[PDB]
Amino acid sequence: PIVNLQAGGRSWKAVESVVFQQLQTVAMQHGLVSEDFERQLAYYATTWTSKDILEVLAMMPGNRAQKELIQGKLNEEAERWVRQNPPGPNVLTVDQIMGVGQTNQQASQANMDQARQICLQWVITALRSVRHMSHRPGNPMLVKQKNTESYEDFIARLLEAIDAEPVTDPIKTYLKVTLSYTNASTDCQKQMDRTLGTRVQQATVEEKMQACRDV
Amino acid sequence: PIVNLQAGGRSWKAVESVVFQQLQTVAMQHGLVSEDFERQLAYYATTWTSKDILEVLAMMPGNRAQKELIQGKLNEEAERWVRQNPPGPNVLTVDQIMGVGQTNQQASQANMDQARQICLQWVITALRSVRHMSHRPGNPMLVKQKNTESYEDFIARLLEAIDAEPVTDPIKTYLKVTLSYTNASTDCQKQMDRTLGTRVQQATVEEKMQACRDV
Amino acid sequence: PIVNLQAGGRSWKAVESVVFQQLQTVAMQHGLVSEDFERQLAYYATTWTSKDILEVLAMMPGNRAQKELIQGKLNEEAERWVRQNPPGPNVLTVDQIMGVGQTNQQASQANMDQARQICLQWVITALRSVRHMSHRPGNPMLVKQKNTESYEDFIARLLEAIDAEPVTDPIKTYLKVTLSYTNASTDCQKQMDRTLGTRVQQATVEEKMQACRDV
Amino acid sequence: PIVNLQAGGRSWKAVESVVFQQLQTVAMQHGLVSEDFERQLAYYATTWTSKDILEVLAMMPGNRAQKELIQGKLNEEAERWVRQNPPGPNVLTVDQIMGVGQTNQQASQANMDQARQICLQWVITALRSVRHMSHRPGNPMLVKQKNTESYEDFIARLLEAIDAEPVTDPIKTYLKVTLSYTNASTDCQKQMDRTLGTRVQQATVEEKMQACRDV
Amino acid sequence: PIVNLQAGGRSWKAVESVVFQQLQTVAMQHGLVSEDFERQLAYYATTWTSKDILEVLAMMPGNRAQKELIQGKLNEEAERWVRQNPPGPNVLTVDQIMGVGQTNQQASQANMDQARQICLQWVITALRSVRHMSHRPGNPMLVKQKNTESYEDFIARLLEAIDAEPVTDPIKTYLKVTLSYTNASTDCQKQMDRTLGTRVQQATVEEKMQACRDV
């Protein structure tokens, strides 16, 4: 965490243990790629020196398979940057954006504030990219209600997947309304046939979750 | 969290990690709509800038299905406000109450103290509205004791549901006394028939929980 | 938490999040009535303004059924106080002891220090009363070793119950020695017959736990 | 926790909530007697006023059966002290060592620094004594690998027990080498027969754990 | 944790409870040897006096079997040092590197800064050595997908093992590509045969995890 000194200097303070205990808890249960982890990182990532944004992503417990796909995506993002930006004095080298060469204090210095933004942007871009592919959220069309699961659950998984897929929001909407009836368990579908009637694939989630989860 | 400066200025300090770790733990187990989460938010929501009251509701892990119904309810509450309050210089625009346009420091400023109250009021109103409909608490009449569950459990679920339903407190009372015998497992009902006798549907929970959970 | 100002004033500081995370964790697993929660509250309840002692009891996650019986016991304790103390200027009204009328700062003021003590005394008295009746600890005579449970477990449940029952300590002692053999599983009883011999119902727990849990 | 004032005075600061959350978490899972709890207490017990060393041992959740055997052992240790030390002005009375009579500030005072050491010594002595007898660690000779458990597990339980038993370290060593083959599951024993050969009861744990846990 | 005084002196501050609660949580679930614990230790080990780096390794809950193999490896590393460095005034004795003789303040002093680095280097070297042998990560060739586990899981275990084995990174790469198809469950293998075709043992994990985990 970059610390702005009273003199206006920038100093490096280690990420407080409490912050990791929050990110890690979300990481192990919801998943490292999981939207939940991405939001958490962003809330606290504003003041994090590039070096930390990478180290903290590494200190996260478990999610080893994900930390593999991500590490690859980050490398690909770096390749795009080196290709997009030919080496130049103003241009920041991939290492500077990674911050690997710099010491913690050097990363905190004002010159690398642009670098921190780029590193966070790659990490967040990478986390999102892995999520649509790793399928910890999953592929929506495939997600279907387990007989044991409540329609509230099927919706939770379906909403995650419909959100994860990189598709325009209009289409997400259609997917939420149409897929909820199609992939749902037959018993909810039957109950929705009795209540929703034709609107079964035209109704909103609010109308539907009330229909099967209630009664 | 709005910070009152010694100069009397208002500054924005990020919600401390410890606060999230408490809200999140209650969120994942009891539920985001769950009365427990609502109380927690309120205890710490007094000093939260509108922007946070929304962001913190978003950083909460899981409860994706609920975060869908809520997001809709908040939008509906905004529609009521814009309809109730025609746009005016004194009137706060929905965005100002959401705080989306403002920077964190701007939200903390004294002018938007009214906005924070309205935003908290919508969030808390929305959480309560989703709870009666999502049925994480459930529909009381439907709640019934699982043979495995103790009468203490059936009461815990029944009390949650009887509280969640938006009905006058007198009626809640009648529901607590009458429903507890009706939806309870037969074995407790038989035991209560032997001890409570006629008052089975007239007795209080204290009398009843002593009857089946004890012996 | 009442804060004694350097000027000697009393100011209200919110219960720190860490304190709740401890009380809540004990609350959900051991139980709100559970002796464990009662001890925790007492350690930190010394500096808590009456309003908090009630609000914190309410912020506790789960234990909804218990929070019902308690709320009733607290009301009964208030009825005893109003009956015991006829209204008078010196007399503190039930509301003042509850602190419902006062603002947080008003509760912290020196005048209501007596009120905080009374409120804590009712809460702790109420928690103890609910425990003997709710039977989260249970009725000792009924507690018996599940075949799966170790004699160490049966003792843990039996000791909880023998302690919970409102009986003079001499009798508790007799119950601990006699009940441990009687309600224990036959296999431990047989093993104790072989080692303890006649003293089976005269031996201490130390002698007995060594007998079945060991070998 | 005794606080050394800048003036050199000693003041009493309550054990921070974070410390309990660590001790309690270790307590409920590993066990109150468990070596793990004993080490934790010692790390933080250096600055704890006798009163706390007892109160904190009491605030620990669960382990009710253990808190019974310990309470007895502490009483026995007190009996040894009163017998060993005839009452005298220099001699500290059992109550002073327990600190029950003193207020928190009085316990923190320099005069009772010797008392805190004695109280910690009894608590730690008591915890160790209960552990060899309670058998939460268990009796080594009895510990045997469950077919499901890995040889890594059997070693974890066997090492705990061989350590718990109050025997000279030389003998512990022999027990670790000999018992590991004898109480282990036959399948590991067969595999060790194939790899260790004669040294089966002469090999070290490092050699053995590599033999069955690996391959 | 060594504290640099404003005077430039070095003072010893106890490891904050929050740090242990993070290390312990990672320790009990992922494992003490687990790469996750090693990274955590390193992030916070920079300012830890040798005495702590050992004591903290000891305060870690559970992993008793591992704490045995490690304790042996640390002793072996010490033997290498005493053999590599003949005793000399400049040479640091094994005890000084362990810090057992020194008081906490003495360890924090500047003279033993070299010792702390050596102690951390042995601990980290020891943790890595135990990991390849204990097989909490396991032997890669042996790791195979359980029918229940997802190909995402098999990859998580396989990647851990391929990383743990002390082999040059080129070979790790070949192992990741070849082993993933070979040890995977037949159903994923069949699906990969249909999609990957010949590249089944030439494809990358990104290509493969998309193939079976998706669809």
From Swiss-Prot, chains A, B, C, D, E:
Superkingdom of origin: Viruses
Protein location: Virion
Role: Forms the core that encapsulates the genomic RNA-nucleocapsid complex in the virion.
Protein's name in the database: Capsid protein p25
Species for this entry: Maedi visna virus (strain 1514) (MVV)
The organism's taxonomic lineage, starting at the top: Viruses, Riboviria, Pararnavirae, Artverviricota, Revtraviricetes
